[PDB]
Amino acid sequence: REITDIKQFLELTRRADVKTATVKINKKLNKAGKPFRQTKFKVRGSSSLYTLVINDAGKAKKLIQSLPPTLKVNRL
């Protein structure tokens, strides 16, 4: 399931069923041909997998820092 709003993603991370999250970086090119870093967040629940995509590195860093202490983040 794809999550469009960051609020929805954070709410899911608070669930006791979710204990781990994975982060993946992908290289992309914009219309002007300039490269940028795309960050993908994945959290697995007992019944479904949730994915969030962030195109800004600064925002992605803030998101990682805002995650609950109970949730462990691993990079692929």
Binding site: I6, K7, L10, K59, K62, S66
Partner: peptide, 24 residues
């Protein structure tokens, strides 16, 4: 043109964080 999005993003993060708790 992402300044407006950044402002809203920060507000969401601040609301989610609740490390400071008042005791009385």
């Amino acid at each position: 043109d992402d300044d407006d999005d950044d402002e809203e993003f920060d507000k969401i993060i601040q609301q989610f964080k609740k490390t400071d708790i008042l005791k009385y």
